[PDB]
């Protein structure tokens, strides 16, 4: 079974899809989170299913992050891994084509604003797994000492799947939510 899941970093102050897709890096905690989410994998000449990421000319970047277990594989579509060139592609359509066709997207919301469900318009986006850093520490409680909020936002009628989660626990927690969301999305695509 193979799944494809977007990962989108939103920088401080950003509100609109085009500027968000242009980003080519995130925060240090975001980068450490990617490294826990999957293994860094070279795309050119790749011998596995790259779920639409270019294997010929590195058009979608040299690397992505990937996960595999005994049953399934996930290829992440990480917009910050994808090259930006606003002369050639001012609307970042080469990045949008991945996340706009992914049922499930992970959003690292560093904007300082609440994430808007209509940020990345697409009739195929069913679920957003939204990660928002917080200064809070669970009152009755190093990556075990710093936390984020995780909230699932989905289309109306989509099956239910905000919780405080340590940075250490975060990649496994989000990957499980993304897998479950993807499985549900495959069924929901038939409604």
Automatic annotation (TrEMBL):
Per UniProt, residues of the Rap-GAP domain are: 1-191
Protein name (Swiss-Prot/TrEMBL):
GTPase activator-like protein
Organism field: Chaetomium thermophilum (strain DSM 1495 / CBS 144.50 / IMI 039719)
Q: Which residues of the full protein are shown?
A: 1288 to 1491 of 1734
